[PDB]
Design a protein around this ligand. Structure first.
Ligand code: IM2
Ligand code: IM2
Ligand code: CA
Ligand code: CA
Ligand code: CA
Ligand code: CA
Ligand code: CL
Ligand code: CL
Ligand code: CL
Ligand code: CL
Lengths: 243, 243
């Protein structure tokens, strides 16, 4: 792979008083683009973008039966109100319900979790820390370019889990669709270890091509979280990927 | 009694100077709703809504290997410009590319198409006519109520084909998604035999319920096609199913 820097994308960070990186990958052309080649390859905690590999492993191992199985609220009231109810895989992904996925990771266990992250070649393949929080405050790290590499394999059903698990997780990643494009993606927000950053990783399905993306950006307060999608979509619009 | 007539929906037809039926099914409550019980049970040619069972059968039989397989344009220039190119299952559904599906039906063949439609309990299960056009000008008939019955089976993966086939077709039915709802659906437009009608059938996925819908309306000319979705969405908004 071969990477072109487009610094003009930086205008969209500048005009929103922000700093970060957008990485794009044109699947047809096998060509990548980014505003910052160095930050594109900087590895960070994945935070809730780890729900993608966690979901795959839980499904492949049968910890999750299917996308309709109900995960009961553990009763503890937490600050994000959508978390304080029962969920299935679809809504747990949509609302990024951490406690549900911590429960998955406990059941998967360290041995199988480590084996699967090596099988996926996911980030630095390091799960040091608590098995139920290592993607929030442990040793795992992944860069935006490494998120693309992983997502490309998921798109092609080439990860070493069942085809069914990959199809279900891609259903659960559904974020936006209309007559012009489909976006499958996952947000993240890493706050437990500096630097506080926001993530958005996934892809845009067109009629005749797929554009993979991965972005992260400094997130000193939660009032900037909507800029994850906003800045990405402005880059997508600039490159004429979406209208 | 599982159906309730709500003639107030007729306002959405009349003020678009239209005649037709909208049928809704509340999956959680197992209760149905329509502006017109009699038209709701009136069977019509399925036209392009037949692409849903046709897709399922082609996938189950390996006629279609997956949603990436390319079906080459046969070089015949047809009136709908988007048909005059290569397609896969996703784009052939999106652009309702009849010639692609006519070829599927020839490969499926008469005997296998008949057995599968009986297994599906699809409409009147009658495939009299040409193997590659019976859903356009042959003997098969299906009502809006019978469309709901079939779609419910598909949603629950209870049809008599592989789980994989059903997941792929449901992916191919994706029409709209946002933070509030997901619509999986298929349009239709029956012209070859009177009465000329337009169809929209599918469902709305919410966080905690699924609403199945099937509508048809008199379609004397091609210019009222947009009201298939518009009128349905007015009924959905009235019942507060979508915001
Ligand atoms: C995943 O990264 C986080 C988890 C680490 O808490 C969840 C929570 C959020 S943002 C909710 C904060 N809003 C109000 N301050 C996300 C997210 O990625 O949006 N995932
Ligand atoms: C399926 O119902 C028809 C097929 C029988 O021709 C295709 C074509 C259309 S509408 C295109 C007409 N526009 C221009 N006048 C559809 C559809 O459902 O929208 N499917
Ligand atoms: Ca901008
Ligand atoms: Ca813990
Ligand atoms: Ca109106
Ligand atoms: Ca029957
Ligand atoms: Cl998480
Ligand atoms: Cl989907
Ligand atoms: Cl067709
Ligand atoms: Cl049933």
């Amino acid at each position: 792979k071969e990477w072109q820097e487009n610094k003009s994308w930086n205008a969209h960070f500048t005009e929103h008083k922000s700093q970060g990186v957008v990485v794009l990958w044109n699947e047809n052309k096998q060509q990548g683009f980014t505003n910052n080649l160095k930050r594109a390859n900087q590895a960070f905690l994945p935070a809730s973008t780890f729900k993608i590999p966690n979901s795959l492993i839980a499904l492949d191992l049968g910890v999750v039966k299917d996308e309709h199985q109900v995960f009961k609220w553990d009763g503890q009231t937490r600050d994000i109100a959508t978390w304080n109810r029962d969920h299935n895989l679809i809504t747990a992904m949509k609302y990024s319900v951490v406690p549900v996925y911590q429960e998955f990771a406990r059941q998967i266990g360290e041995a199988r979790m480590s084996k699967m992250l090596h099988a996926f070649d996911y980030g630095n393949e390091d799960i040091s820390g608590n098995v139920d929080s290592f993607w929030l405050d442990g040793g795992i790290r992944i860069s935006a370019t490494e998120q693309i590499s992983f997502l490309r394999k998921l798109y092609h059903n080439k990860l070493h889990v069942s085809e069914r698990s990959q199809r279900i997780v891609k259903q659960a990643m559904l974020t936006e669709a209309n007559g012009d494009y489909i976006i499958r993606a996952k947000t993240g927000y890493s706050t437990r270890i500096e630097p506080k950053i926001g993530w958005w990783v996934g892809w845009v399905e067109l009629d005749d091509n797929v554009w993979f993306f991965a972005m992260n950006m400094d997130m000193p307060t939660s009032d900037g979280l909507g800029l994850r999608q906003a800045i990405t979509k402005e880059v997508l619009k600039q490159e004429k990927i979406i209208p």
